[PDB]
Design a protein around this ligand. Structure first.
Ligand SMILES: O=C(Nc1ccccc1)Nc1ccccc1
Ligand SMILES: O=C(Nc1ccccc1)Nc1ccccc1
Ligand SMILES: O=C(Nc1ccccc1)Nc1ccccc1
Ligand SMILES: O=C(Nc1ccccc1)Nc1ccccc1
Ligand code: NA
Ligand code: NA
Length: 154
C-alpha cells in the first residue's frame, strides 16, 4: 500500500527562474549553490524522462548520494516528476518513493514549490516520522540555498 504526503516550499525567486535553476541548469547550479552538495553527475539519458542523475552530498561527516530518475517533465507548466532509484533516499526500509512537483506563483512574485510524495515501505512499517521531519528540514535548507544563490547571481 501507498502512503501519500503533500508539502509546500516557498521561495522569493520567480517560478520560471527557479525552474530553470533546478531542472534545466540543475547539473551546474545545484552544486554551485548548495554548500552541502558536492556534485551532480548525469549517468543516463538526455535530460528527458528516464534520465538518472546522481547527487552527492555531505551529512553527519559522511559523503552520501542519491539517484534521481526523471519520471515526467512539463517545462511549459513548471512540472517535474522524479523518483529515487537508489543511494540513501531509497533505504532498505523504502521499496519505492516518488515526487510530483509543480512551481506556482507565490507571494510578491515568488514561488510555491508544491510536492506530492508517494512512498511504499518494506514490510508493515510506516514511513519513519523522524526521517520525514529531517527530510523536510533538508528540503527547506536546499530551497533556501538555491534562493540565496540566485538572488546574488541572476
Ligand atoms: O532536483 C531537485 N528538484 C527539482 C525541483 C524542481 C524541478 C526539478 C527538480 N531536487 C532535489 C532536492 C533535494 C535533494 C536533491 C534533489
Ligand atoms: O524542497 C523541495 N522543493 C521544491 C523545489 C522545486 C520544485 C518543487 C519543490 N523539494 C524537495 C522535496 C523532498 C525532498 C527534498 C526536496
Ligand atoms: O524520506 C523522505 N525523503 C528523502 C528524500 C531524499 C533522500 C532521502 C530521504 N521523505 C519523507 C516524506 C514524507 C514522510 C516521511 C519521509
Ligand atoms: O542533504 C541536504 N540536501 C540534499 C541533497 C541531496 C539529496 C538529499 C538532500 N541538505 C542538508 C541539509 C541540512 C543538513 C545537511 C544536509
Ligand atoms: Na556545493
Ligand atoms: Na509497507
Amino acid at each position: 500500500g501507498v502512503f501519500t504526503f503533500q508539502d509546500e516550499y516557498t521561495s522569493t525567486i520567480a517560478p520560471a527562474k527557479l525552474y530553470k535553476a533546478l531542472v534545466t541548469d540543475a547539473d551546474i547550479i545545484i552544486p554551485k549553490a548548495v554548500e552541502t552538495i558536492q556534485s551532480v553527475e548525469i549517468v543516463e539519458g538526455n535530460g528527458g524522462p528516464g534520465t538518472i542523475k546522481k547527487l552527492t552530498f555531505i551529512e553527519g561527516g559522511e559523503s552520501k548520494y542519491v539517484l534521481h530518475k526523471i519520471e515526467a517533465i512539463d517545462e511549459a507548466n513548471l512540472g517535474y516528476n522524479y523518483s529515487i532509484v537508489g543511494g540513501v533516499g531509497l533505504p532498505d526500509t523504502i521499496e519505492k518513493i516518488s515526487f510530483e512537483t509543480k512551481l506556482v506563483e507565490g507571494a510578491n512574485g515568488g514561488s510555491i514549490g508544491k510536492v506530492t510524495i508517494k512512498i511504499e515501505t518494506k514490510g508493515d512499517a510506516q514511513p519513519n516520522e523522524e526521517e520525514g521531519k529531517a527530510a523536510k528540514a533538508r528540503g527547506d535548507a536546499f530551497f533556501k540555498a538555491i534562493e540565496s544563490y540566485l538572488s546574488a547571481h541572476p
